[PDB]
Short mmCIF file of C-alpha atoms in Angstrom, two decimals:
data_model
loop_
_atom_site.label_atom_id
_atom_site.label_comp_id
_atom_site.label_asym_id
_atom_site.label_seq_id
_atom_site.Cartn_x
_atom_site.Cartn_y
_atom_site.Cartn_z
CA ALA A 1 70.25 92.44 -162.12
CA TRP A 2 72.89 91.84 -164.82
CA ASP A 3 73.06 89.74 -167.97
CA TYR A 4 76.50 88.14 -167.98
CA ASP A 5 75.83 86.67 -171.46
CA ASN A 6 74.93 89.94 -173.13
CA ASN A 7 76.11 92.85 -170.99
CA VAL A 8 79.76 93.99 -170.59
CA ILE A 9 81.15 95.19 -167.26
CA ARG A 10 82.81 98.61 -167.45
CA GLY A 11 83.97 99.34 -163.97
CA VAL A 12 86.48 100.56 -161.44
CA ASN A 13 87.72 99.21 -158.15
CA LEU A 14 87.17 101.34 -155.04
CA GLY A 15 90.60 100.44 -153.74
CA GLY A 16 92.35 101.99 -150.74
CA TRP A 17 89.02 102.71 -149.01
CA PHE A 18 88.36 99.89 -146.52
CA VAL A 19 91.75 98.20 -146.79
CA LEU A 20 94.73 100.54 -146.54
CA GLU A 21 97.41 100.20 -149.23
CA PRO A 22 100.52 102.34 -148.66
CA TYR A 23 101.18 103.11 -152.36
CA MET A 24 97.60 104.36 -152.80
CA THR A 25 97.41 106.64 -149.69
CA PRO A 26 101.06 107.27 -148.80
CA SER A 27 100.05 110.31 -146.69
CA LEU A 28 98.73 107.97 -143.99
CA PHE A 29 102.12 106.20 -143.75
CA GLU A 30 104.65 108.99 -144.43
CA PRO A 31 104.34 110.61 -140.99
CA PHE A 32 106.19 107.57 -139.60
CA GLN A 33 109.27 108.17 -141.78
CA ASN A 34 112.36 109.53 -140.01
CA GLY A 35 113.87 111.74 -142.69
CA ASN A 36 114.92 109.35 -145.45
CA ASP A 37 114.71 106.37 -143.09
CA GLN A 38 111.66 104.18 -143.81
CA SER A 39 112.60 101.46 -141.33
CA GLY A 40 109.94 102.54 -138.84
CA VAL A 41 107.02 102.88 -141.28
CA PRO A 42 104.28 100.29 -140.57
CA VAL A 43 104.11 97.96 -143.59
CA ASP A 44 100.40 97.16 -143.60
CA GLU A 45 97.04 97.99 -141.97
CA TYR A 46 97.68 95.38 -139.29
CA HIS A 47 100.85 97.16 -138.10
CA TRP A 48 99.49 100.67 -138.83
CA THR A 49 96.49 100.17 -136.47
CA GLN A 50 98.72 98.38 -133.90
CA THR A 51 101.25 101.23 -133.86
CA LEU A 52 98.57 103.91 -133.52
CA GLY A 53 96.37 102.13 -131.02
CA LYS A 54 92.60 101.82 -131.18
CA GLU A 55 91.69 105.45 -130.46
CA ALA A 56 94.03 107.21 -132.91
CA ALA A 57 93.40 104.52 -135.61
CA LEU A 58 89.63 105.03 -135.43
CA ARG A 59 89.87 108.84 -135.50
CA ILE A 60 92.16 108.84 -138.53
CA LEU A 61 90.19 106.11 -140.34
CA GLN A 62 86.80 107.74 -139.77
CA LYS A 63 88.10 110.81 -141.54
CA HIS A 64 89.51 108.58 -144.35
CA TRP A 65 86.33 106.54 -144.78
CA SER A 66 84.15 109.64 -144.82
CA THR A 67 86.24 111.52 -147.46
CA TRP A 68 88.13 109.08 -149.73
CA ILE A 69 84.98 108.01 -151.62
CA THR A 70 81.64 109.82 -151.38
CA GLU A 71 78.35 110.03 -153.30
CA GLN A 72 79.98 112.54 -155.72
CA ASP A 73 82.46 109.84 -156.84
CA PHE A 74 79.55 107.56 -157.77
CA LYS A 75 77.97 110.37 -159.79
CA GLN A 76 81.27 110.93 -161.65
CA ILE A 77 81.67 107.17 -162.27
CA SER A 78 78.21 107.02 -163.89
CA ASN A 79 78.86 110.23 -165.85
CA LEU A 80 82.00 108.67 -167.30
CA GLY A 81 79.92 105.82 -168.69
CA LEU A 82 80.95 103.20 -166.16
CA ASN A 83 78.29 100.72 -164.95
CA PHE A 84 80.03 98.85 -162.13
CA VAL A 85 82.26 99.04 -159.04
CA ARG A 86 84.21 96.36 -157.18
CA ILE A 87 84.42 96.98 -153.42
CA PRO A 88 87.32 95.45 -151.47
CA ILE A 89 86.71 94.89 -147.72
CA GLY A 90 88.72 92.99 -145.11
CA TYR A 91 87.46 90.29 -142.73
CA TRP A 92 88.07 92.62 -139.76
CA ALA A 93 85.09 94.80 -140.78
CA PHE A 94 82.91 91.91 -139.60
CA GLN A 95 84.91 89.89 -137.09
CA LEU A 96 88.10 90.35 -135.06
CA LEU A 97 90.47 87.60 -133.98
CA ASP A 98 91.54 87.75 -130.34
CA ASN A 99 94.29 90.36 -130.06
CA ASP A 100 93.60 91.78 -133.60
CA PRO A 101 94.66 95.51 -133.73
CA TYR A 102 92.10 96.36 -136.39
CA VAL A 103 89.31 98.86 -135.90
CA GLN A 104 85.72 98.50 -137.17
CA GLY A 105 83.20 100.84 -138.70
CA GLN A 106 83.64 100.14 -142.39
CA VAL A 107 80.22 98.45 -142.73
CA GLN A 108 78.40 101.78 -142.18
CA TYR A 109 80.15 103.17 -145.27
CA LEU A 110 79.78 99.97 -147.25
CA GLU A 111 76.00 100.30 -146.81
CA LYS A 112 76.03 104.00 -147.80
CA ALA A 113 77.96 102.99 -150.95
CA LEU A 114 75.33 100.36 -151.85
CA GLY A 115 72.70 103.12 -151.71
CA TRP A 116 74.82 105.49 -153.77
CA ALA A 117 75.26 102.68 -156.31
CA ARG A 118 71.47 102.17 -156.51
CA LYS A 119 70.88 105.89 -156.94
CA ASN A 120 73.36 106.06 -159.84
CA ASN A 121 72.46 102.80 -161.66
CA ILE A 122 75.78 101.17 -160.73
CA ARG A 123 76.10 97.43 -159.96
CA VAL A 124 78.53 96.01 -157.40
CA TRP A 125 80.71 93.12 -156.37
CA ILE A 126 81.56 92.81 -152.72
CA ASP A 127 85.07 91.36 -152.47
CA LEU A 128 86.59 89.76 -149.35
CA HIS A 129 90.03 91.16 -149.90
CA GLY A 130 91.76 90.03 -146.69
CA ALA A 131 91.35 86.76 -144.78
CA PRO A 132 92.65 85.98 -141.25
CA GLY A 133 96.34 84.94 -141.27
CA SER A 134 96.57 86.21 -144.87
CA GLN A 135 95.87 84.25 -148.01
CA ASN A 136 98.81 85.74 -149.95
CA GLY A 137 101.33 87.69 -147.80
CA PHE A 138 100.56 90.92 -149.74
CA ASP A 139 100.11 94.18 -147.92
CA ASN A 140 96.66 94.45 -149.59
CA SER A 141 95.43 91.47 -147.49
CA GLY A 142 96.01 93.47 -144.29
CA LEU A 143 99.04 91.42 -143.25
CA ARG A 144 102.25 91.30 -145.25
CA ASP A 145 104.71 88.39 -145.40
CA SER A 146 102.37 85.87 -143.64
CA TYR A 147 100.62 82.93 -145.33
CA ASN A 148 98.44 81.41 -142.62
CA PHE A 149 94.93 81.35 -144.11
CA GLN A 150 95.01 77.52 -144.21
CA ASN A 151 96.48 77.17 -140.70
CA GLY A 152 94.61 76.59 -137.51
CA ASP A 153 91.03 77.89 -137.56
CA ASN A 154 91.61 80.70 -140.07
CA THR A 155 89.68 79.01 -142.95
CA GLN A 156 86.68 78.39 -140.65
CA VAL A 157 86.74 82.00 -139.39
CA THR A 158 86.79 83.13 -143.06
CA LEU A 159 83.70 81.01 -143.83
CA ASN A 160 81.91 82.47 -140.79
CA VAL A 161 82.65 86.02 -142.07
CA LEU A 162 81.37 85.02 -145.55
CA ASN A 163 78.17 83.72 -143.99
CA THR A 164 77.62 87.13 -142.44
CA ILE A 165 78.23 88.80 -145.80
CA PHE A 166 75.85 86.25 -147.45
CA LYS A 167 72.99 86.98 -145.04
CA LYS A 168 73.42 90.74 -145.17
CA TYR A 169 74.17 91.35 -148.87
CA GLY A 170 73.17 88.20 -150.78
CA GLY A 171 69.41 88.48 -150.04
CA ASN A 172 66.41 90.33 -151.49
CA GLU A 173 67.40 93.66 -149.99
CA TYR A 174 70.28 94.28 -152.41
CA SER A 175 69.38 92.06 -155.35
CA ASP A 176 69.03 95.14 -157.58
CA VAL A 177 72.63 96.32 -156.84
CA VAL A 178 74.82 93.34 -155.80
CA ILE A 179 75.71 91.17 -158.84
CA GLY A 180 78.46 89.14 -157.19
CA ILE A 181 80.15 88.19 -153.92
CA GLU A 182 83.82 87.39 -154.37
CA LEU A 183 84.79 84.74 -151.83
CA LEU A 184 88.48 85.65 -151.53
CA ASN A 185 90.83 88.04 -153.36
CA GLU A 186 94.09 86.54 -154.78
CA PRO A 187 94.73 83.41 -152.76
CA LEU A 188 98.37 82.68 -153.64
CA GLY A 189 97.97 79.30 -155.34
CA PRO A 190 101.65 78.27 -155.45
CA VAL A 191 102.02 78.39 -151.65
CA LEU A 192 98.60 76.97 -150.76
CA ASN A 193 97.07 73.52 -150.70
CA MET A 194 94.88 73.65 -153.82
CA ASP A 195 92.60 70.80 -152.68
CA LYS A 196 91.78 72.64 -149.50
CA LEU A 197 91.27 75.91 -151.42
CA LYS A 198 88.79 74.17 -153.73
CA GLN A 199 86.95 72.77 -150.71
CA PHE A 200 86.73 76.27 -149.25
CA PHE A 201 85.28 77.64 -152.55
CA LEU A 202 82.73 74.81 -152.63
CA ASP A 203 81.73 75.36 -148.97
CA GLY A 204 81.21 79.10 -149.65
CA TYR A 205 79.23 78.30 -152.84
CA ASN A 206 76.98 75.82 -151.00
CA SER A 207 76.58 78.08 -147.94
CA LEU A 208 75.39 81.02 -150.01
CA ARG A 209 72.89 78.96 -152.06
CA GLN A 210 71.52 77.34 -148.89
CA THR A 211 70.47 80.80 -147.68
CA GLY A 212 68.19 81.02 -150.72
CA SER A 213 70.53 83.42 -152.44
CA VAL A 214 70.72 83.47 -156.28
CA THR A 215 73.64 85.95 -156.19
CA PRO A 216 76.56 85.07 -158.42
CA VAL A 217 79.65 83.60 -156.72
CA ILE A 218 82.90 85.16 -157.99
CA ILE A 219 86.02 83.02 -157.63
CA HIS A 220 89.47 84.54 -158.13
CA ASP A 221 91.69 82.32 -160.38
CA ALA A 222 94.36 81.83 -157.64
CA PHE A 223 97.07 82.63 -160.24
CA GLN A 224 96.35 79.40 -162.15
CA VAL A 225 96.72 78.90 -165.92
CA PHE A 226 93.80 79.87 -168.20
CA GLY A 227 91.18 77.06 -168.20
CA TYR A 228 92.24 75.59 -164.87
CA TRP A 229 88.78 76.25 -163.45
CA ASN A 230 86.80 74.95 -166.45
CA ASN A 231 85.83 71.72 -164.64
CA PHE A 232 84.98 73.26 -161.24
CA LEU A 233 81.55 74.52 -160.14
CA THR A 234 79.84 73.44 -163.35
CA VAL A 235 76.28 73.42 -164.62
CA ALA A 236 76.77 69.66 -165.23
CA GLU A 237 76.95 69.26 -161.44
CA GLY A 238 74.06 71.66 -160.66
CA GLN A 239 76.35 74.54 -159.72
CA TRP A 240 75.30 77.78 -161.37
CA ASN A 241 75.84 81.60 -161.41
CA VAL A 242 79.60 81.35 -161.09
CA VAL A 243 82.07 83.89 -162.50
CA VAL A 244 85.88 83.65 -162.65
CA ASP A 245 87.93 86.78 -161.82
CA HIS A 246 91.28 87.11 -163.66
CA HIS A 247 93.73 89.84 -162.66
CA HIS A 248 96.15 90.99 -165.34
CA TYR A 249 99.33 93.03 -164.88
CA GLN A 250 102.70 93.21 -166.62
CA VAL A 251 104.70 94.84 -163.81
CA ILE A 252 105.43 92.11 -161.25
CA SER A 253 108.71 90.77 -162.68
CA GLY A 254 111.83 91.96 -164.51
CA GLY A 255 110.96 89.85 -167.54
CA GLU A 256 107.60 91.61 -167.86
CA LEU A 257 109.08 95.08 -167.33
CA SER A 258 111.76 94.69 -170.05
CA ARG A 259 109.24 93.86 -172.81
CA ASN A 260 108.96 96.42 -175.60
CA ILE A 261 105.56 98.05 -176.15
CA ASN A 262 104.65 95.78 -179.08
CA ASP A 263 105.25 92.69 -176.92
CA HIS A 264 103.21 94.23 -174.07
CA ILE A 265 100.37 94.60 -176.54
CA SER A 266 100.74 91.06 -177.83
CA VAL A 267 100.48 89.70 -174.24
CA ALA A 268 97.33 91.84 -173.64
CA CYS A 269 95.70 90.61 -176.84
CA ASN A 270 96.47 86.99 -175.88
CA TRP A 271 94.67 87.48 -172.55
CA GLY A 272 91.57 88.04 -174.68
CA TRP A 273 92.00 85.04 -176.97
CA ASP A 274 92.65 82.70 -174.05
CA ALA A 275 89.85 83.93 -171.76
CA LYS A 276 87.40 83.34 -174.68
CA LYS A 277 88.23 79.61 -174.60
CA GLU A 278 87.15 79.24 -170.96
CA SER A 279 83.90 77.61 -170.00
CA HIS A 280 82.83 80.04 -167.21
CA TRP A 281 81.75 83.66 -167.38
CA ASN A 282 84.92 85.64 -166.67
CA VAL A 283 85.76 89.27 -165.92
CA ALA A 284 89.12 91.08 -165.70
CA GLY A 285 88.54 92.24 -162.09
CA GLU A 286 91.89 94.07 -161.85
CA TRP A 287 94.25 95.61 -164.41
CA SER A 288 95.86 99.01 -164.90
CA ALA A 289 97.80 101.28 -167.24
CA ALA A 290 101.11 100.66 -165.45
CA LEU A 291 104.09 99.71 -167.65
CA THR A 292 106.45 100.25 -164.68
CA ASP A 293 106.57 99.44 -160.98
CA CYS A 294 107.79 103.01 -160.16
CA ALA A 295 104.94 104.08 -157.86
CA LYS A 296 106.35 104.66 -154.40
CA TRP A 297 105.81 101.54 -152.23
CA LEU A 298 103.97 99.59 -154.99
CA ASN A 299 106.12 96.56 -154.02
CA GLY A 300 105.65 97.35 -150.36
CA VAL A 301 106.79 99.79 -147.73
CA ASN A 302 110.60 100.05 -147.69
CA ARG A 303 110.94 98.27 -151.05
CA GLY A 304 112.13 99.89 -154.25
CA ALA A 305 111.28 99.52 -157.94
CA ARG A 306 112.54 96.70 -160.14
CA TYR A 307 112.24 99.13 -163.05
CA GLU A 308 115.28 101.14 -161.87
CA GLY A 309 117.15 98.07 -160.55
CA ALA A 310 116.40 99.00 -156.95
CA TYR A 311 114.68 95.78 -155.80
CA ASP A 312 115.01 92.02 -155.97
CA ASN A 313 118.24 92.03 -158.01
CA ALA A 314 116.39 93.43 -161.02
CA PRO A 315 118.47 95.05 -163.74
CA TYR A 316 118.11 98.82 -164.32
CA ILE A 317 115.72 99.57 -167.14
CA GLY A 318 115.03 103.25 -166.56
CA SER A 319 114.81 106.02 -163.99
CA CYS A 320 111.51 106.27 -162.08
CA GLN A 321 111.82 109.92 -161.10
CA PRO A 322 110.71 111.28 -164.51
CA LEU A 323 107.67 108.96 -164.49
CA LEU A 324 106.24 109.93 -161.04
CA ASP A 325 104.42 113.00 -162.47
CA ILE A 326 102.20 112.61 -165.49
CA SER A 327 102.96 116.23 -166.51
CA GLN A 328 106.61 115.15 -166.96
CA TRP A 329 105.94 112.09 -169.19
CA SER A 330 107.46 112.06 -172.68
CA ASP A 331 105.18 112.00 -175.70
CA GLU A 332 106.37 108.46 -176.34
CA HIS A 333 105.35 107.25 -172.88
CA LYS A 334 101.92 108.84 -173.22
CA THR A 335 101.40 107.17 -176.60
CA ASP A 336 102.59 103.76 -175.29
CA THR A 337 100.18 104.11 -172.34
CA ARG A 338 97.20 104.94 -174.59
CA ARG A 339 98.01 101.94 -176.88
CA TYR A 340 98.28 99.63 -173.89
CA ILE A 341 95.01 100.80 -172.36
CA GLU A 342 93.13 100.36 -175.64
CA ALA A 343 94.54 96.87 -176.26
CA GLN A 344 93.48 95.74 -172.75
CA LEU A 345 89.98 97.25 -173.16
CA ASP A 346 89.47 95.36 -176.45
CA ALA A 347 90.78 92.08 -174.92
CA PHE A 348 88.60 92.35 -171.82
CA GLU A 349 85.43 93.42 -173.70
CA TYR A 350 85.91 90.27 -175.81
CA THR A 351 84.64 88.36 -172.74
CA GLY A 352 82.77 89.66 -169.64
CA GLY A 353 84.32 93.15 -169.32
CA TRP A 354 86.81 94.88 -167.06
CA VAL A 355 87.38 96.59 -163.70
CA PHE A 356 90.29 99.03 -163.61
CA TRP A 357 92.51 99.21 -160.48
CA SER A 358 91.75 101.80 -159.19
CA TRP A 359 89.32 104.79 -159.29
CA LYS A 360 91.83 107.05 -157.49
CA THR A 361 95.24 107.31 -155.83
CA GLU A 362 96.81 110.23 -153.98
CA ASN A 363 99.63 110.63 -156.48
CA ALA A 364 100.24 107.45 -158.51
CA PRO A 365 98.98 108.30 -162.05
CA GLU A 366 99.43 104.81 -163.64
CA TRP A 367 96.93 103.45 -161.07
CA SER A 368 94.28 106.22 -161.18
CA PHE A 369 91.31 106.07 -163.53
CA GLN A 370 90.55 109.74 -162.75
CA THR A 371 94.06 111.01 -163.51
CA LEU A 372 94.40 109.02 -166.74
CA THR A 373 90.95 110.19 -167.92
CA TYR A 374 91.58 113.89 -167.16
CA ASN A 375 94.90 113.70 -168.99
CA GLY A 376 93.37 112.14 -172.11
CA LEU A 377 95.10 108.77 -171.77
CA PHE A 378 92.08 106.71 -170.85
CA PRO A 379 89.49 106.83 -173.67
CA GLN A 380 86.48 109.02 -172.96
CA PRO A 381 83.98 107.89 -174.03
CA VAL A 382 85.43 104.51 -173.13
CA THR A 383 84.63 103.21 -176.64
CA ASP A 384 86.93 105.79 -178.31
CA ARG A 385 90.01 104.38 -180.06
CA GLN A 386 93.07 106.19 -181.28
CA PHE A 387 94.63 102.77 -182.05
CA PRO A 388 91.75 100.75 -183.39
CA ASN A 389 91.87 96.97 -183.74
CA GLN A 390 95.31 96.24 -182.38
CA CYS A 391 94.32 92.60 -181.60
CA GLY A 392 92.21 91.50 -184.59
CA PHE A 393 89.54 89.64 -182.62
CA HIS A 394 86.66 88.03 -184.51
#
């Protein structure tokens, strides 16, 4: 239902929908603040649902699920010339561990979204964004500061959840809409056993194909160097319809944040050159317009911004307050943002395409496709260039 050789993905993530992320929907977390004291704010969905209990969690989440993304969003996405969405979902939508605080119900809306996608000629990846015990310790896995995916029976539970996803969404019923199942979002390579992670990817690959599914398998790069995956799941070995998902940001360290705009652009262009050398189909499954980490709680609940020297011993670069509202941005910051967006688009269109993180946020403009588009910073149509040919690809 997609030609990965000839077509280019132009998509957005539907983030914050089925996995809560505080920086994306701060209104769900802010009621737990005690004045300026954030010490009692739950840091992730795990603790949010635990603190509320099953009844309050389900009431609040049903309202969230039913309003955050609707059919009208899918219409707008198509109208903007996008052809694709990536849908993050956590393991808990399908299976709970004993004593898990999570609530269920997300699958109902997942299936509505697949229909809305069909109706609007939009293709989809389903992405297992959170595994039991956490594969990365990020709040976007469900469970912050824990790295237990490879401990105990957590890997086997994850495979069982994937098998459910394979039987439901990897078959004939959705073969016109689903163009990939992503086995696991952002496993944190440096802290994991890479041999065991490869075995997990292979087991998921084989399990899906054994169901009779021809659906592409999407593997996240696990924060490895470009080309690391060139020799894994290869046509030589009879393994086929495999896509590598690279995520690209320049806001996670002080070194990245202190780069001037020209050096930001050079790094973006190089993402394109280097992805082109790889032997698998590859798609930039996450990226954004952010040149700062100023969005409230981007680094986590009760953590500040490296950009203003408020976290992790980072030096002060600039004040975040002026950058929280896009109406307050200087002309220079707007121009830098537009340049950066265009450079990334050119780099990512040089291989399989791109998937912006994310469609919408409550009030974080660097991270909202909608906000950037309405303010003229994201090209519309997406092929428009005010800064043509920054990278010089051929």
